[PDB]
Design an enzyme around this catalytic site. Structure first.
Site, PDB file in Angstrom:
ATOM      1  N   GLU B 357      36.222  17.055 -25.165  1.00  0.00           N
ATOM      2  CA  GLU B 357      36.689  16.209 -24.162  1.00  0.00           C
ATOM      3  C   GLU B 357      37.991  15.760 -24.501  1.00  0.00           C
ATOM      4  O   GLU B 357      39.090  15.627 -23.588  1.00  0.00           O
ATOM      5  CB  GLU B 357      35.844  15.011 -23.850  1.00  0.00           C
ATOM      6  N   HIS B 487      25.445  27.057  -8.597  1.00  0.00           N
ATOM      7  CA  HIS B 487      26.642  27.532  -8.145  1.00  0.00           C
ATOM      8  C   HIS B 487      26.565  28.677  -7.150  1.00  0.00           C
ATOM      9  O   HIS B 487      27.098  29.796  -7.343  1.00  0.00           O
ATOM     10  CB  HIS B 487      27.415  28.115  -9.197  1.00  0.00           C
TER      11      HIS B 487
END
Ligand SMILES: *[C@@H]1O[C@H](CO)[C@@H](O[C@@H]2O[C@H](CO)[C@@H](O)[C@H](O)[C@H]2NC(C)=O)[C@H](O)[C@H]1NC(C)=O
Ligand SMILES: *[C@@H]1O[C@H](CO)[C@@H](O)[C@H](O)[C@H]1NC(C)=O
Ligand SMILES: *[C@@H]1O[C@H](CO)[C@@H](O)[C@H](O)[C@H]1NC(C)=O
Lengths: 247, 596
Positions: B357, B487
């Site tokens: 991150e 997805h």
């Protein structure tokens, strides 16, 4: 004031101590182009002009001798023979607003680049194309003055920075602003050299009983040789005798 | 004045007012996620609606500019984003029906509901529990039942729904003058700028499988090893000629074999390199975690972290009424403001997640100078590839000993190397066939050559060869198996994940050369090499202002796609598996089924 309404101030007939401003660690940027700041206290000009405003933190590069940019082109321009200095410091603690300091605005649209020491005050709506703009904005109409969205949390580069540009003009009129003199103390009854208010010479300084009429400064007897002087800081009549010599 | 200057002025006027409003919206989003409160929900409503009602008009007025004469291709691409029809090109009825049908797919998938026959009055969801039971188990009946039920309650009623979605989204593609929505997805990996750097939507489709068969020599050996371990674990439930069913893949969609890793452990005598005991013993908190990550990046070459980040960003402990969802995220709110959001923990895996991150955050600062329409990467996969680069680099034993995470007298050997490589490949290369087959199936269901019936049976028969999934209970017509995938129902382009692993492999390989390391790629550290950071910054600073094909020219000189790092990284695993399953025959047959 905003950058398009840069504040121009004139100062004359005062003593300026540039050292204390130079000896100020709380100021972010201090860039001098004329001479060294330490030497500035010695020499002097006839008047001083200050251009004060606030710009964005990332635009500080624009204010420089022979520098171009949106602020430099449409808000305030500089020549290359600038004498003086530039001072800048962050104002996020003051000018940045949680509700947004949109008061500050800058000219993004303008027909021509602004001249040095020149201001464009008109708020004319700009024509980015070929059609004329009649009042309300149309296709080729965008507001010349863009506001600023300063926030308390915008990183270093986006904070509002106050900038004061100081120039010194040396017109043929007598100099009005100069640095201090740093007068020393006094000694007596010893062969020393003196420079009282620009009048220099060697000798021994003693007390005297002469009566200077209250507007003379110094007195010479005959053949134009100074005898008595009046001390500027104490206003008493001294006396001068040449140091001993002989074969 | 020519129209091109007018285009520049309009773009500048748009982005100037867009930056502040986007910053306000991002600030509201960060406030809502850092403070889970009802008022921030209304703040989100009143910021998002305002941002949309501001952006839609600016995009709408992007038509009177004839965007075919701008000499600056950067300005042309900047104006391209506003000159997009988007979702308003369709008619109101079809567009609103599409939005409603996306909403109902999202709700249905998020509300997966199946009851075991013993408790028909109380079902369970994909939330931990039933999902955990069917994901962490050694059995054949419960996982198969759960898979059948999931396909019969998410796939049963979603067949006409997904058909309508596909046809209407592809009709919107024609509304953008695209014969298929696959072209719309592939437009991201397509540039018509620099001659010799241009690309087409079509070529990507073929090159996806052009790089897919080169890893299959290792895939067959890994499948043979998995089948042998299944023989040693699952008694006579997998045919030696054939392969394993869907419910035995660890994940219900065959994404990863990490849940199946324990079955196919290479050698359990030497476990994984875990420094959690040392990580806790050193008394290094999340603040020290971030500081050490910053120092490691500085040694790599990336600069210091900006201030305010230590204040604005949250790191750990949502705790009290001041609730905060901590899904690992990087926040570039604009206007020089950055935040990071995790429940960072004292763990090597959490250390790698925080590294991921904060590398995302570093890349966020990397393109700072670019405008709002160019504050992104060359392509959406580069960001994630970068974010995993240091995650790869922050776990190597040499890096651990350099900063004193491992013991000063720690050494590795062949057994731990083999175990680590096999576990890593169970996730990295074990998903590439599944990723490729899902992407290709989505491409051919968008194109529509296959009829309605050849949707789920065709998907299974192709998964038999590609992934190696037999049908204990096949799904022919009344079930929509791909509809039971996250997805598939939210309009998510999925080739980005496929390209991300290859991209990160190439970047790690290039950094390994330009970091002065010797030996295998999996044992490569890129710390204390500032030139590596300089090359990284050269890659990163380009941003969206440069084509992705041009971007793929400094780190790796091949503007095309290569698979060399994939083969080189799992080389010891391949050479071990060549001599491992010597008696067994590699590959699997696509004829045997568990029912017959
Ligand atoms: C110049 O400034 C000095 C410093 O204040 C003045 O000196 C003082 O003057 C007052 C007024 O008579 C005396 O009471 C102090 O004793 C002086 N302090 C000293 C000499 O150290 C001086 O008078 C000023 N010059 C003027 C006013 O012409
Ligand atoms: C959007 O679709 C309309 C409908 O045909 C078309 O006229 C227009 O050219 C499209 N916009 C662009 C930028 O091509
Ligand atoms: C980061 O800041 C610290 C403290 O100011 C400094 O010692 C260090 O050299 C800086 N590192 C970089 C890469 O700028």
């Amino acid at each position: 004031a905003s950058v398009y309404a840069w504040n121009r101030k004139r100062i004359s007939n005062c003593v300026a101590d540039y050292s204390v401003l130079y000896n100020s660690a709380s100021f972010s940027t201090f860039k001098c182009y004329g001479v060294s700041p330490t030497k500035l206290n010695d020499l002097c000009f006839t008047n001083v002009y200050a251009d004060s405003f606030v710009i964005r933190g990332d635009e500080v590069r624009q204010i420089a001798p022979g520098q171009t940019g949106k602020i430099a082109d449409y808000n305030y321009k500089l020549p290359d023979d600038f004498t003086g200095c530039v001072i800048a410091w962050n104002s996020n603690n003051l000018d940045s607003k949680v509700g947004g300091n949109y008061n500050y605005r800058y000219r993004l649209f303008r027909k021509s680049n602004l001249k040095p020491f020149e201001r464009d005050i008109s708020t004319e709506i700009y024509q980015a194309g070929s059609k004329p703009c009649n009042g309300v904005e149309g296709f080729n109409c965008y507001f010349p003055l863009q506001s600023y969205g300063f926030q308390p949390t915008n990183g270093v580069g986006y904070q509002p920075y106050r900038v004061v540009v100081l120039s010194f003009e040396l017109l043929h009129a007598p100099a009005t602003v100069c640095g201090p003199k740093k007068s020393t103390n006094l000694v007596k009854n010893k062969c020393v050299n003196f420079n009282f208010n620009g009048l220099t010479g060697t000798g021994v300084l003693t007390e005297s009983n002469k009566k200077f009429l209250p507007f003379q400064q110094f007195g010479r007897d005959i053949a134009d040789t100074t005898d008595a002087v009046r001390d500027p800081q104490t206003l008493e009549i001294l006396d001068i005798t040449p140091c001993s010599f002989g074969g | 004045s020519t129209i091109e200057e007018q285009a520049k002025t309009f773009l500048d006027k748009f982005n100037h007012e867009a930056e502040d409003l986007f910053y306000q919206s991002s600030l509201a989003s960060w406030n809502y996620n850092t403070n889970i409160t009802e008022e921030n929900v209304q703040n989100m409503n009143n910021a998002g609606d305002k941002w949309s009602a501001f952006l839609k008009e600016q995009s709408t007025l992007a038509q009177m500019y004839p965007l075919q004469e701008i000499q600056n291709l950067t300005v042309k691409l900047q104006l391209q984003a506003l000159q997009q029809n988007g979702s308003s090109v369709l008619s109101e009825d079809k567009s609103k029906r599409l939005n409603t049908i996306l909403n109902t797919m999202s709700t249905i998938y998020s509300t997966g509901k199946v009851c075991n026959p013993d408790n028909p009055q109380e079902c369970l969801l994909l939330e931990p529990g039933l999902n955990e039971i069917m994901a962490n188990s050694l059995d054949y009946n419960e996982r198969l039942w759960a898979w059948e039920s999931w396909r019969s309650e998410v796939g049963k009623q979603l067949r006409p729904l997904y058909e309508e979605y596909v046809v209407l989204k592809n009709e919107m593609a024609r509304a953008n003058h695209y014969e298929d929505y696959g072209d719309y997805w592939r437009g991201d990996y397509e540039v018509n700028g620099v001659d010799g750097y241009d690309y087409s939507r079509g070529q990507l489709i073929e090159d996806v499988e052009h790089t897919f068969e080169e890893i299959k020599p290792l895939y067959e050996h890994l499948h043979a090893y998995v089948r042998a371990k299944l023989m040693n674990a699952y008694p006579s439930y997998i045919s030696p000629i054939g392969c394993l069913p869907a419910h035995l893949l660890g994940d219900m969609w065959g994404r990863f074999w990490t849940n199946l890793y324990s079955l196919t452990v290479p050698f359990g005598q030497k476990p994984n390199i875990d420094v959690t005991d040392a990580m806790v013993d050193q008394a290094w908190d999340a603040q020290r975690i971030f500081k050490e990550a910053e120092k490691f990046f500085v040694s790599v070459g990336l600069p210091n972290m900006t201030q305010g980040f230590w204040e604005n960003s949250m790191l750990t402990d949502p705790g009290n009424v001041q609730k905060a969802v901590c899904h690992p995220t990087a926040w570039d709110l604009g206007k020089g403001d950055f935040r990071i959001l995790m429940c960072t923990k004292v763990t090597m895996d959490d250390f790698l997640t925080a590294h991921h991150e904060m590398g995302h955050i570093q890349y966020d600062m990397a393109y700072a100078a670019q405008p709002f329409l160019l504050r992104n990467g060359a392509n959406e996969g580069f960001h994630e590839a970068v974010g995993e680069i240091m995650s790869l680099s922050a776990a190597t034993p040499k890096h651990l000993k350099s900063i004193g995470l491992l013991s000063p007298d720690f050494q590795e050997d062949n057994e731990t190397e083999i175990n680590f490589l096999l576990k890593q490949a169970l996730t990295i290369v074990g998903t590439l066939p599944f990723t490729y087959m899902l992407e290709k199936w989505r491409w051919m269901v968008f194109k529509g050559e296959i009829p309605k019936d050849q949707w789920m049976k065709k998907w299974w028969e192709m998964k038999r060869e590609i992934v190696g999934v037999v049908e204990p209970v096949p799904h022919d017509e009344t079930y929509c198996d791909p509809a039971s995938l996250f997805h598939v129902s939210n309009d998510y382009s999925f080739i980005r994940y496929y390209t991300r692993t290859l991209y990160q492999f190439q970047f790690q390989e290039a950094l390994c050369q330009a970091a002065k390391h010797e030996g295998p790629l999996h044992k490569c550290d890129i710390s204390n090499s500032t030139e590596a950071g300089q090359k990284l910054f050269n890659m990163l600073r380009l941003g969206k202002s440069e084509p992705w094909t041009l971007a793929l020219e400094n780190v790796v000189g091949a503007k095309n796609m290569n698979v060399r790092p994939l083969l080189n990284y799992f080389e010891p695993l391949f050479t071990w598996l060549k001599d491992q399953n010597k008696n067994s025959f590699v590959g699997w047959s696509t004829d045997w089924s568990p029912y017959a």
